Design a protein around this ligand. Structure first.
Ligand code: OAN
Ligand code: BK9
Length: 685
């Protein structure tokens, strides 16, 4: 499946062998990056003046003079033709010729080419990725891999702006990169240029910027530095800041200054972009006028970025019309998917969808903000490259499958199985969700109520769950050992481990459903409990970031199914045999008695009670740790401690209820007379 799909495609059914003897026409006047690709394809084939002609070049070249009228008159457009007599690879520009070769390479199968006529061009002018997330910035090697991936999928934009790069954001955005980083950035630009990608260096100065000559000059001096490293596209982000830096009049004036004294002075600067402080409709203030000030004052050639109606949002026709009228220009979309820096315990490997497919002319650009997991993000990036190039023929699921099969041919279905059940973000402050496990959801749904009630589940639904769990284990084990894309595996490995544990736990619970004899049920029960403890261990030792630590997987349909199925069968067992087995579904080494049902959670060196959305009102709550730990503090948000529970030692409190424990021994905590937060922090391992 050609990705992206071309605008115009006519496929006659006839296969042409890749010629052993060929005459190369226009190879010395054509895009070097395109010809190099063409010669890579033809290695063991000799070139002489006798043989099948291959015409490569840009419009205006003598080599493709014949086909100048068949070439699309769009930027980055190209004409491709294959018949039994000659091969034509003609771009409207150099980037167009390169893109003709990327399509040409996909057509090559079994050293055989189909006879085909293609006229192709992008519906959107700028298409690519913005590395603009919070978290560990992409490694150098990952970024090199990304740029080669962009070239293949006809993405012409890479905007560098990792939030946690100290030379991108505050305060060291004033300082030039050290020699080591600078050498690396210089390499990224060279590689980006070979792949026809515009490397856009973004700066994020707004937080501590002052509107004067001094900071103006340092910003321009920093841009001059990047320019010496090869950078020819630049951006200025004013997102996520407070203070004077939020001034629209001043931002416009700054960008116009950059535009007029730098971008227009240099002979070869391409893109100039800015991210406004108000980058979505929901956080746009209607009382004052920020967006219309930018629209009127900012030079038209300058791009303005937009994430949609909300921070995380799908782009609609009415939504983009809303912003465009205010900024007086077509918006440059910053789409915050599959970025997961606010749900860092989830991987987002599902399909790209929700964005309107008819609004191509209403947007100046479209870039995707990704996960800090570079390889894992290629699934979305592949799909965005497809949506961006030809939104009209954009096929959500098909492109998702093609992405997976492109990224990991040796284990496509295993990676498909894994990503099928790792797409939803789970609950979050943005309220942004994605479908997950839709294949098996109807069967999982029906099974649960049937089980919960006296009714009888359909056998088919039961076997569907068995197959799913069995297939998940296969996928997990095969992915772990896969050597085709080692960096990909390193990224997802913790989730793969948790994935397999989920599958195993599910298998054991299904065996508890049948039940048969009593001894067998207990064996499965003890096994499930041990599996809960293993999932707990991974959740506490893998991916321990400061925000959403741990590893969650299959959260939308599967984990609730297994948990609810487990809690119900244990309930029936306690009823039948008059037992008192624990129906808890998440392991918790500590205890909390008394806010009665609220489960405890461990996050790093914190032991906390799961908050609620209700209104709470000489009662007391007690938390018992599994051992004695040195206490740091106790942050309650709307007190007494002991090491044995006999001798209690009162602690004084202070919006936020602070209480230093001063490394005192802690095991029991109590609070005698709404709950936003109830955290005990203890000393770390
Ligand atoms: C324009 C934009 O998307 N900014 C950040 C963005 N976050 O917007 C915020 O919610 N930032 C914020 C909100 C309130 C207080 C402080 C920062 O969306 C992405 C995923 O969350 C981040 O990667 C971006 O860096
Ligand atoms: C001023 C810092 O904010 C942040 N810090 C860390 N992670 C984040 C993830 C999404 C949005 C914001 C974030």
């Amino acid at each position: 499946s050609l990705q992206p799909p071309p605008q115009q495609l006519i496929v006659q059914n006839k296969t042409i062998d890749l010629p052993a003897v060929y005459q190369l026409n226009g190879g010395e006047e054509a895009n070097p990056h395109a010809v190099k690709v063409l010669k890579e394809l033809l290695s063991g084939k000799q070139s002489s003046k006798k043989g099948m002609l291959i015409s490569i070049g840009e419009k205006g070249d003598k080599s493709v003079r014949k086909y100048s009228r068949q070439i699309p008159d769009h930027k980055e457009g190209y004409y491709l033709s294959v018949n039994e007599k000659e091969i034509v690879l003609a771009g409207n520009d150099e980037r167009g010729t390169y893109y003709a070769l990327q399509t040409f390479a996909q057509l090559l199968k079994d050293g055989k080419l189909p006879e085909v006529e293609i006229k192709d061009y992008p519906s959107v002018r700028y298409r690519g990725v913005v590395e603009g997330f919070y978290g560990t910035p992409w490694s150098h090697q990952a970024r090199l891999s990304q740029l080669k991936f962009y070239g293949k999928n006809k993405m012409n934009t890479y905007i560098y702006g990792p939030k946690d790069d100290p030379y991108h954001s505050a305060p060291n955005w004033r300082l030039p990169y050290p020699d080591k980083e600078a050498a690396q950035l210089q390499e990224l630009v060279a590689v980006a240029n070979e792949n026809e990608v515009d490397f856009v260096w973004a700066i994020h100065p707004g937080q501590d910027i002052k509107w004067n000559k001094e900071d103006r000059d340092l910003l321009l001096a920093k841009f001059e530095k990047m320019y010496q490293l090869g950078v020819r596209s630049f951006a200025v982000f004013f997102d996520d800041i407070s203070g004077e830096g939020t001034n629209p009049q001043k931002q416009a004036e700054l960008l116009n200054y950059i535009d007029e004294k730098f971008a227009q002075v240099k002979p070869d600067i391409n893109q100039l972009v800015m991210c406004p402080t108000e980058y979505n409709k929901s956080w746009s203030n209607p009382n004052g006028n920020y967006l219309t000030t930018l629209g009127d004052k900012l030079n038209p050639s300058i791009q303005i970025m937009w994430t949609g109606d909300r921070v995380i949002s799908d782009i609609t026709r009415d939504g983009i019309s809303w912003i465009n009228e205010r900024i007086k220009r077509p918006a440059y979309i910053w789409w915050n998917f599959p970025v997961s820096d606010y749900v860092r315990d989830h991987l987002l490997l599902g399909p790209v969808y929700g964005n309107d497919t008819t609004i191509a002319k209403e947007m100046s650009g479209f870039v995707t903000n990704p996960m800090e997991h570079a390889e894992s993000s290629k699934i979305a990036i592949y799909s965005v490259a497809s949506y961006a190039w030809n939104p009209a023929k954009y096929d959500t699921w098909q492109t998702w499958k093609d992405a997976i099969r492109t990224i990991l041919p040796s284990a496509a279905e295993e990676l498909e199985c894994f990503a099928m059940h790792n797409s939803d973000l789970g609950p979050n402050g943005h309220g942004y969700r994605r479908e997950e496990s839709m294949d098996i959801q109807p069967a999982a749904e029906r099974f649960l109520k049937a089980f919960k009630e006296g009714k009888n589940y359909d056998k088919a639904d039961f076997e569907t769950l068995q197959y799913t769990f069995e297939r998940m284990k296969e996928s997990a084990d095969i992915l772990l050992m896969n050597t085709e894309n080692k960096p990909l595996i390193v990224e997802i490995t913790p989730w793969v481990h948790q994935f397999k544990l989920t599958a195993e736990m599910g298998e054991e619970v299904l065996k508890m459903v049948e039940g048969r004899n009593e001894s067998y049920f207990l064996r499965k029960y003890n096994h499930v409990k041990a599996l809960q403890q293993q999932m707990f261990y991974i959740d506490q030792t893998s991916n321990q970031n400061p925000y959403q630590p741990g590893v969650k997987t299959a959260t939308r349909v599967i984990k609730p199914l297994i948990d609810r199925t487990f809690a119900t069968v244990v309930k029936f067992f306690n009823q039948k045999f008059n037992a008192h087995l624990d129906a808890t579904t998440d392991y918790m080494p500590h205890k909390m008695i008394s806010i009665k049902n609220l489960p405890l959670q461990v996050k790093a060196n914190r032991v906390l009670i799961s908050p609620a959305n209700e209104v709470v009102k000489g009662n007391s709550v007690e938390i018992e740790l599994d051992a004695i730990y040195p206490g740091e503090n106790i942050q309650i948000n709307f007190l007494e401690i002991s090491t044995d529970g006999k001798e209690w030692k009162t602690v004084d409190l202070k919006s936020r209820l602070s209480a230093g424990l001063q490394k005192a021994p802690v095991k029991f905590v109590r609070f005698t007379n709404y709950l936003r937060q109830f955290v005990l922090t203890i000393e770390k391992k």
